[PDB]
Amino acid sequence: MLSVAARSGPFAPVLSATSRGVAGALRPLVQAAVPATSESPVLDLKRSVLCRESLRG
Amino acid sequence: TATYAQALQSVPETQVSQLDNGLRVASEQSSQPTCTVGVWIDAGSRYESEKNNGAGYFVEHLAFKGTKNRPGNALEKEVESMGAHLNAYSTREHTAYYIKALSKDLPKAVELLADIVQNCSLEDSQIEKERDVILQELQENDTSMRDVVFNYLHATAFQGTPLAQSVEGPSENVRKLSRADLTEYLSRHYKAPRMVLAAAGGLEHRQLLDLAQKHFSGLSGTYDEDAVPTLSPCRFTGSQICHREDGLPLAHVAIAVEGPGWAHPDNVALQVANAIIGHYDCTYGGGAHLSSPLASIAATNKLCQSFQTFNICYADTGLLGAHFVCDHMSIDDMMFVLQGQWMRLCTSATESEVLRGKNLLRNALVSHLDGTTPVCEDIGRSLLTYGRRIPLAEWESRIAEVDARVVREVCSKYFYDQCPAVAGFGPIEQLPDYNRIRSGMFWLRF
Amino acid sequence: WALVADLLTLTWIGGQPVEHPYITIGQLASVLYFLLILVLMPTAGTIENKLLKW
Amino acid sequence: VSASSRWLEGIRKWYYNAAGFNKLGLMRDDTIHENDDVKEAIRRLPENLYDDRVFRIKRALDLSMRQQILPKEQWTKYEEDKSYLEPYLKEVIRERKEREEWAKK
Amino acid sequence: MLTRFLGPRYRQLARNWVPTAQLWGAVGAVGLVWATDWRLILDWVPYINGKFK
Amino acid sequence: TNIRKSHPLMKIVNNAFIDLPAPSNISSWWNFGSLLGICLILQILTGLFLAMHY
Amino acid sequence: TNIRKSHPLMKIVNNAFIDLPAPSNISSWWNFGSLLGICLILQILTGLFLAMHY
Amino acid sequence: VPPHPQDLEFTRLPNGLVIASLENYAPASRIGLFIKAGSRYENSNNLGTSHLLRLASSLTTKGASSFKITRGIEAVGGKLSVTSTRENMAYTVECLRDDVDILMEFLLNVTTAPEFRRWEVAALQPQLRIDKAVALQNPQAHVIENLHAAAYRNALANSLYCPDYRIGKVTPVELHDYVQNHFTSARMALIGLGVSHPVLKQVAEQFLNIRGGLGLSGAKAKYHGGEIREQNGDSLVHAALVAESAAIGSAEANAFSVLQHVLGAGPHVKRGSNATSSLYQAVAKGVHQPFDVSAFNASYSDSGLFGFYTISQAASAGDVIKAAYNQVKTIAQGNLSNPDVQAAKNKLKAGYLMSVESSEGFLDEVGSQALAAGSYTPPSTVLQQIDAVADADVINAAKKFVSGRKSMAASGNLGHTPFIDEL
Amino acid sequence: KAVALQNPQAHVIENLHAAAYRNALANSLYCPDYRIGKVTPVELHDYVQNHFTSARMALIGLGVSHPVLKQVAEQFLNIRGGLGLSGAKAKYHGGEIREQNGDSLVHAALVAESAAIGSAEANAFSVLQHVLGAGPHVKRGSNATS
Amino acid sequence: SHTDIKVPDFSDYRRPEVLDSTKSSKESSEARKGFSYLVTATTTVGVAY
Ligand code: HEM
Ligand code: HEM
Ligand code: HEM
Ligand code: HEM
Ligand SMILES: COC1=C(OC)C(=O)C(C/C=C(\C)CCC=C(C)C)=C(C)C1=O
Ligand SMILES: COC1=C(OC)C(=O)C(C/C=C(\C)CCC=C(C)C)=C(C)C1=O
Numbered sequence A: 001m002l003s004v005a006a007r008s009g010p011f012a013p014v015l016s017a018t019s020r021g022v023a024g025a026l027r028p029l030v031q032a033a034v035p036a037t038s039e040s041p042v043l044d045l046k047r048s049v050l051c052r053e054s055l056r057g
Numbered sequence B: 001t002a003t004y005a006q007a008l009q010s011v012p013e014t015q016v017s018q019l020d021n022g023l024r025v026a027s028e029q030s031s032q033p034t035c036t037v038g039v040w041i042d043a044g045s046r047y048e049s050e051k052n053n054g055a056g057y058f059v060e061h062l063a064f065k066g067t068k069n070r071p072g073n074a075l076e077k078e079v080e081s082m083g084a085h086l087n088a089y090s091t092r093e094h095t096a097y098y099i100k101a102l103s104k105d106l107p108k109a110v111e112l113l114a115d116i117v118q119n120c121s122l123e124d125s126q127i128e129k130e131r132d133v134i135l136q137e138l139q140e141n142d143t144s145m146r147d148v149v150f151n152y153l154h155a156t157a158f159q160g161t162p163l164a165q166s167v168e169g170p171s172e173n174v175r176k177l178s179r180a181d182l183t184e185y186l187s188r189h190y191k192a193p194r195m196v197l198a199a200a201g202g203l204e205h206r207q208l209l210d211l212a213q214k215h216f217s218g219l220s221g222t223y224d225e226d227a228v229p230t231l232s233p234c235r236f237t238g239s240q241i242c243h244r245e246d247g248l249p250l251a252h253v254a255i256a257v258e259g260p261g262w263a264h265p266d267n268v269a270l271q272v273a274n275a276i277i278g279h280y281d282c283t284y285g286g287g288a289h290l291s292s293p294l295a296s297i298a299a300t301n302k303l304c305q306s307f308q309t310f311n312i313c314y315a316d317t318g319l320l321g322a323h324f325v326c327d328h329m330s331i332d333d334m335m336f337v338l339q340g341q342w343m344r345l346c347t348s349a350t351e352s353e354v355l356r357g358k359n360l361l362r363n364a365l366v367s368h369l370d371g372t373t374p375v376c377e378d379i380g381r382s383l384l385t386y387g388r389r390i391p392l393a394e395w396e397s398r399i400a401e402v403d404a405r406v407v408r409e410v411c412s413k414y415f416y417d418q419c420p421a422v423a424g425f426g427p428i429e430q431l432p433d434y435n436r437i438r439s440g441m442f443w444l445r446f
Numbered sequence C: 001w002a003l004v005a006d007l008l009t010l011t012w013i014g015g016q017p018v019e020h021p022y023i024t025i026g027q028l029a030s031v032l033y034f035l036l037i038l039v040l041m042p043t044a045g046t047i048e049n050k051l052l053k054w
Numbered sequence D: 001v002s003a004s005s006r007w008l009e010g011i012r013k014w015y016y017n018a019a020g021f022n023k024l025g026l027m028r029d030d031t032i033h034e035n036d037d038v039k040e041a042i043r044r045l046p047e048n049l050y051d052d053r054v055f056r057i058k059r060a061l062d063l064s065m066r067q068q069i070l071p072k073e074q075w076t077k078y079e080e081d082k083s084y085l086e087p088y089l090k091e092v093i094r095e096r097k098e099r100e101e102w103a104k105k
Numbered sequence E: 001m002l003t004r005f006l007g008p009r010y011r012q013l014a015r016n017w018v019p020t021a022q023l024w025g026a027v028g029a030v031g032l033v034w035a036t037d038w039r040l041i042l043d044w045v046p047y048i049n050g051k052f053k
Numbered sequence F, G: 001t002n003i004r005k006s007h008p009l010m011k012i013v014n015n016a017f018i019d020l021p022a023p024s025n026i027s028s029w030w031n032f033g034s035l036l037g038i039c040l041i042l043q044i045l046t047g048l049f050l051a052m053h054y
Numbered sequence H: 001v002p003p004h005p006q007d008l009e010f011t012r013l014p015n016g017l018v019i020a021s022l023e024n025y026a027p028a029s030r031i032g033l034f035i036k037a038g039s040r041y042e043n044s045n046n047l048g049t050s051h052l053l054r055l056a057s058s059l060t061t062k063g064a065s066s067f068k069i070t071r072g073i074e075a076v077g078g079k080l081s082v083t084s085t086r087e088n089m090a091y092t093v094e095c096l097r098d099d100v101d102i103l104m105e106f107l108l109n110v111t112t113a114p115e116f117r118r119w120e121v122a123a124l125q126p127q128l129r130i131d132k133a134v135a136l137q138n139p140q141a142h143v144i145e146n147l148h149a150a151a152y153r154n155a156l157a158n159s160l161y162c163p164d165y166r167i168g169k170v171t172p173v174e175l176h177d178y179v180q181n182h183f184t185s186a187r188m189a190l191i192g193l194g195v196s197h198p199v200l201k202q203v204a205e206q207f208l209n210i211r212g213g214l215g216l217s218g219a220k221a222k223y224h225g226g227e228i229r230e231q232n233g234d235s236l237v238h239a240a241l242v243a244e245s246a247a248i249g250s251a252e253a254n255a256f257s258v259l260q261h262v263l264g265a266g267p268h269v270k271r272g273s274n275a276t277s278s279l280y281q282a283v284a285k286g287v288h289q290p291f292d293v294s295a296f297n298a299s300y301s302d303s304g305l306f307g308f309y310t311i312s313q314a315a316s317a318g319d320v321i322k323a324a325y326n327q328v329k330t331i332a333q334g335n336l337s338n339p340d341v342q343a344a345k346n347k348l349k350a351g352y353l354m355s356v357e358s359s360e361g362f363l364d365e366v367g368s369q370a371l372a373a374g375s376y377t378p379p380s381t382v383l384q385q386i387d388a389v390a391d392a393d394v395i396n397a398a399k400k401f402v403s404g405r406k407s408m409a410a411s412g413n414l415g416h417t418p419f420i421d422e423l
Numbered sequence I: 001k002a003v004a005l006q007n008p009q010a011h012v013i014e015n016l017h018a019a020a021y022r023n024a025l026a027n028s029l030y031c032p033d034y035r036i037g038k039v040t041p042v043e044l045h046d047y048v049q050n051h052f053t054s055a056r057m058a059l060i061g062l063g064v065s066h067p068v069l070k071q072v073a074e075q076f077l078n079i080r081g082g083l084g085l086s087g088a089k090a091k092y093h094g095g096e097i098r099e100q101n102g103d104s105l106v107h108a109a110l111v112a113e114s115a116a117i118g119s120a121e122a123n124a125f126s127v128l129q130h131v132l133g134a135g136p137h138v139k140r141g142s143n144a145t146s
Numbered sequence J: 001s002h003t004d005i006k007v008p009d010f011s012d013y014r015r016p017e018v019l020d021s022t023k024s025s026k027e028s029s030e031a032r033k034g035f036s037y038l039v040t041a042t043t044t045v046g047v048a049y
Helices: B004-010 B053-064 B073-079 B106-118 B124-141 B147-155 B171-174 B179-189 B205-216 B267-278 B293-301 B328-348 B349-369 B372-384 B392-400 B404-414 B434-439 C002-014 C023-050 D004-018 D036-044 D047-065 D086-102 E008-016 E018-036 F010-019 F032-051 G008-018 G032-051 H048-056 H067-074 H097-112 H118-135 H139-151 H171-184 H197-207 H249-262 H278-286 H318-330 H340-356 H359-373 H379-388 H391-403 I010-018 I043-051 I066-076 I120-134 J028-047
Strands: A013-016 B013-017 B024-029 B033-041 B083-088 B097-101 B195-201 B240-245 B250-261 B277-282 B308-312 B318-326 B421-426 H009-012 H019-020 H028-035 H079-084 H090-095 H188-193 H226-231 H235-246 H293-297 H304-313 H407-413
Touching: A013 H226, B004 B392, B004 H097, B024 B073, B024 B147, B024 B372, B033 B372, B033 H226, B033 H340, B053 B097, B053 B124, B053 H197, B073 B106, B073 D036, B073 H097, B073 H340, B097 B106, B097 H340, B106 B195, B106 B205, B124 B171, B124 B179, B124 F010, B147 B240, B147 B250, B147 B318, B147 B421, B147 H226, B195 B205, B205 H293, B205 H359, B250 B328, B250 B404, B250 D036, B267 B308, B267 B349, B267 B392, B267 B404, B267 B421, B277 B293, B293 B328, B318 B328, B328 B404, B328 E008, B349 B392, B349 B404, B349 E008, B349 H028, B349 H067, B349 H090, B372 H249, B392 H019, B392 H235, B404 H278, B434 H304, C002 C023, C023 D004, D036 D086, D036 H118, D036 H226, E008 E018, E008 H067, H019 H197, H019 H359, H028 H097, H028 H359, H048 H079, H048 H090, H048 H171, H048 H188, H067 H079, H067 H097, H079 H097, H090 H359, H097 H197, H097 H359, H118 H171, H139 H226, H139 H235, H139 H304, H139 H407, H188 H197, H235 H318, H249 H278, H249 H293, H249 H318, H249 H340, H249 H359, H278 H293, H293 H318, H304 H318, H318 H391, H340 H379, H340 H391, H379 H391
Parallel strands: B024 B195, B240 B421, H019 H188, H226 H407
Antiparallel strands: A013 H079, B013 B024, B033 B097, B033 B195, B083 B097, B250 B318, B250 B421, B277 B308, B308 B318, H009 H019, H028 H090, H028 H188, H079 H090, H235 H304, H235 H407, H293 H304
8 A cells, every 4th residue: 555645645746848846745725625714826926736638629 | 559549449338328307327337446426417607697696606515514314414424434525516507516436335325416416405504604605715716816817707708698607606696695596596407307427437337227216216207397498698799807906926817719619519629729839837847848839938938927728618609718827027928929829820730730739639638538537527517518428539530630721720710800808817017908919819911 | 352353453444445455354353253252252161161170 | 091181181280370360379169150059059168168268269359459469389289279169069050950850840 | 051941841831821922912913003004914904994995 | 029029120119109108098189299290201202302393 | 327328318329339348359440330420421511511502 | 348457467677676567458558667766865965956856857868859858748749747755756658559669768768868968957957946936835845844854864854845055056967876876777666557568578678777876765764853843924824743653564554544544634525524534523622713634644665754734723723733632642542433443444445446546546556566565466455454454553553643752843823833842 | 134144153043042942032133034024013113112111221321421311211211001021931942953054064053051141150151151162362273271 | 706896788889789698799790890891991992092
């Protein structure tokens, strides 16, 4: 049941050529968007989330 | 070893079956021990009035907070205890509620979905707690420059139509929507012929059918008749909304022409052309050497922080264009280059780049359809918009047929000398005047 | 320097009647002017590059 | 190898001496005309060579100004004439040519 | 060394711009003709026979 | 980059008649500057043709 | 700040004849540009005075 | 009617390299080269080298210039991505079946023949600062980086992001050295999806026979403990409390994973109360308004960090942390059900199976397993291993957390955030 | 702050204090980066009104006369309405702060809680400081008595 | 809250062919550009003369 990062918790950065720089393992956050006022930038000196190279027709 | 072409044929045909209701039940069986079940509904915000707006977004909040058979928090307790995940979304045109769970748990997952989608307990105390929650979310969404600009772009492009509305509604509606309002919207839209039970993974289609008859029998049968309207077309306008705010540090701009709707065959050629232009972000490796000229010129000259092309689809219309984020002194250069690429493609698109576009598109299609969740979603959405499930082999055929001539003909039709809808937010003093953006939509060379 | 010298010849001839010597020398100098600029000078540059192993 | 190669080599040595950049302590590569390929190669030079190249050009422009020349012993000797730029220039060109091939398809 | 612009894409480029380069030449011609009143060329046009014979 | 914005000659044009930030509310009365411009050229052009016979 | 460097009119002068970075080794042969400048003005000035009687 | 599947084929070469491949009859292919080269292999003299390296995947190689790598991969619409953790670096490459060959070649070139040219490396340095700024906008990233710096004195203490003082200072020779000594056969695994075993095995025998670097999984992470505090003013305090737990692969690790679900990892319901989450309900009971909690569990080759992470208003930090800590104490004292552990087991199993649903998740799990264990453990046996975890094992893990020397990192306005001393 | 921080000692001593105390003495003499640009006029006003008061003040003069200073103090320094004593009380805690740098030279400070100024024990510490060694007394010396 | 951002009615200014929210604008687009470009074409013809 290895794969340290997916065993949820420790951090795991991704770099890419066509896709985007990701920093994303586990800690809370998700249950703070509910009891709210968990702001966020809207692309302050940034990049972009959700990322691209998926679609359809 | 199998070829790419051959592999497309190996994908199991999505099985479609109809209930005596109008409830379509569709599935794509794989071999996975996990699955995803859900209900896709032809309900959004393009269906709402004005006083009413925010109705479904409001229902989404109440949806998982109690049913009549499962009160206050009992549902959560069931989903969580089997290790499942329950989620939901809503756009201007679609609402979805889906469970991501273990394959054995399929009986329970459908049973819960049914209970949520029909026997919902919009209890007064809860609907009252949700108004504070939603208003907070509106306050949150305001900080996301990107979400704001796409709401602005919709609001200007679709001016007096229901499509100009945001999903969440105006604050005045959030604080005034009644239980009666919600119950009525539910009655009007959450009915069988407008919903599709979708699933993907280790399930046999008969299981899904049995479950659909077992737990969804009791909708549209003794229902329908008078009070079921269709969707009226939405006039695209073509204008500009500029929200000047020098306090924010980067400008956000979103520009688009009117695209055709979901149904139109030419969404494929548009997606190829969009792919050629692609996307960029300051964390991409490869700056100067990127194929897309916009991306390349943007990276070397540092004309932006990010940009993305898009092709948003609605009933018989859509927004086709791009969005970018940049420093106050780079909005003009950024627009020039963006527009320069659209015209180039409209007139002088070459063959090699079209193959790249087609290739980027074949990868996107397949890379996206990876996992029970995106496929389940794909089945549900397709049936609502296409009436069919379009197999990968067909999408391939449609992609394969695109050559340069098609790109310059299809881009011309939508872009060449057309009025864009422009939305700007942030430090936009240098956002070019509308006439100039309009004059960049055609070329005097040509 | 042969171009400058050829341009002296050209002006000198230009200031002279179109009779004996003058016709054929002024005719050949004209060819030289264009042979020099159009063919000879470029060719020299290629040769020079080569002598320098460039 | 023999008589002929030495004769072409001595003709090359002769041109070199006649060319006269040596007289201003310059090296052949210091005289190259600066186009983009070259501007890039200069950029790619390592710290030491780059610094030496500026001092040489400076030494020459200074000489060229007062129309003097270096004592004969300080002239750069042919084939002691290190072509420091060549490998960089070659690669920059090779890189451009590949871009160019890709631009054709 | 103009072999840089010789290949399939450039060949595709040239063709995409032909109807345009051709129509630009029609503009230039009629434009030259009408502006100098090109007797030779004009006399063939049905109307615009304002030079009788 | 563009062509208008960067070219030494076109810059001047761009900065004076294309991208020049102008007030949105100037009225006729502001036209006399360009009209003097036209009158100056008109005076020069008809003035030259007269000088060819005067 | 200075006066030469900042004034709209003087800037032009400064950037063209005062602080203009010039190579330290240009020789006579580079003088003909200014000499053409002088010849142009000399031609205009004597040219105008002749036009007052011609 | 889906096609009957295929089994994964696995092979250890005598030089230590591992090759694993699955033939799913997919339109696309996925190849990843997993290497034991994460930040834990950096030291005081070369910090950040694995970061710049991670950002350097498209610089020129022998056999493939930067321009080619970029244009070539984009021409077929594929991807090249490098992902790092404190232990591994993974180069994954993606494309349709018909194009595996060219992508494989670029992959081999990036990983075994990089040239790291002086000027290309100089031009890339500023990317460290852009890359690091983007990661650091999530408060979690600072916290977890400081958590590790605080917990270990060693290797796991290193950051995944280049220290500021090193930006612009990492050299081409340091990249060369990092590759030569970590990108070797015995530290590598070639995983494939949508390819065939002979092909991967051929490629590995022809191109991945490199060896002359270092040897095992470490210098050995020496857990130390302590705390790092970053004053910030963010309205929200982020804090992580942790203790040494167990190394991955060991039976105790699974006990910790089950403990993580008894307490509470992420949410399962959109905008839910999180009824089955022990930590959450425990904090909520005495704290009214904006907050989040979750158990944290990191497991490495020779160590592990387990505990919880909290997000809360500056003044409630103490209360949130104390409530959370006391909740764990409660399980350590025996107050743990049987249906609780059962529910946790179901949450853990459902999630793992969900984690390998897709190509990306599957490939990463196979690659990491190859590195950590040198094996491939089927989902059935992982489910079996989880089931072997008894209630007493979970109780014992909780008890280990409660009495172990702690490590903590926190950011925000820390005026009411306790010091460990005070827990 | 940049000018002070070019002496490696200043970072060290600021971190030494941050590490040693959980409180007041932990504060830095230099504004934290995140606060630069954020301190408000109201915060300055508040800091003055509550700390610049009579009971917390001393007017010292050199080359002036006592009556004059005393007159000035009675006319202008009668301000009071702030806080009271010498603290919230520094709670010594202990711990360590480590800053990776690459400076060729490592700067380190090792310390323990000693005694408050004014107490007899403080003088013992001052004498200990000289037994061990403070600064140098001879230019370029071996420092024999250290 | 940015969701309250109205878009002021422009019926007062809209060409007649674009007055209905019920239907496409694409239909009248050609006639609309036609009309506006005819004006500039006729003008250039005039100026040419
Ligand atoms: C050859 C004669 C002149 C030419 C070609 C000329 C040209 C112009 C032009 C093109 C403008 C800008 C547009 C406008 O406001 O009209 C302007 C503005 C102005 N001119 Fe002149 N003009 C001339 C004579 C004058 C005179 C006689 C005066 C008064 C002594 C004058 C003082 C101004 C001023 C103050 C402005 C600024 C007006 C404003 O911005 O409100 N110029 N001129
Ligand atoms: C350098 C350009 C100009 C040239 C070459 C030029 C040349 C001439 C010539 C040859 C005449 C005598 C022929 C005649 O009387 O019709 C004349 C008359 C005159 N011009 Fe100019 N001129 C020029 C610009 C101006 C300007 C700037 C003005 C001032 C608005 C001006 C105002 C006059 C007037 C008032 C007359 C006499 C009235 C008349 O037309 O009989 N012209 N010019
Ligand atoms: C009204 C006639 C001309 C004027 C007033 C003029 C003025 C000048 C001036 C002031 C300079 C800078 C100083 C110098 O090098 O001399 C210059 C340089 C130059 N001119 Fe001219 N010149 C004129 C005719 C020409 C001609 C006939 C050519 C050749 C077609 C020419 C091409 C150049 C070039 C290439 C330079 C740069 C030379 C260098 O920097 O080495 N100009 N000119
Ligand atoms: C706009 C300034 C100029 C004016 C007003 C001007 C005016 C005149 C006039 C009135 C004459 C006839 C009087 C005479 O023959 O002496 C003349 C002759 C001539 N000018 Fe100019 N001119 C000007 C600039 C030039 C320029 C640029 C050149 C070319 C170098 C030039 C070369 C000549 C020549 C060759 C003659 C005839 C030879 C002679 O002096 O007899 N002048 N000019
Ligand atoms: C924003 O205010 C301005 C205008 O609007 C009132 C103008 O119309 C013009 C027009 C000036 C022209 C066309 C140049 C003519 C000068 C010559 C020497 C021919 C200028 C400069 C201007 O600044
Ligand atoms: C650094 O090289 C240069 C010189 O040294 C060779 C010059 O002497 C001049 C002199 C030019 C003058 C005085 C302007 C004359 C032009 C007119 C229209 C009167 C220029 C521009 C120059 O660049």
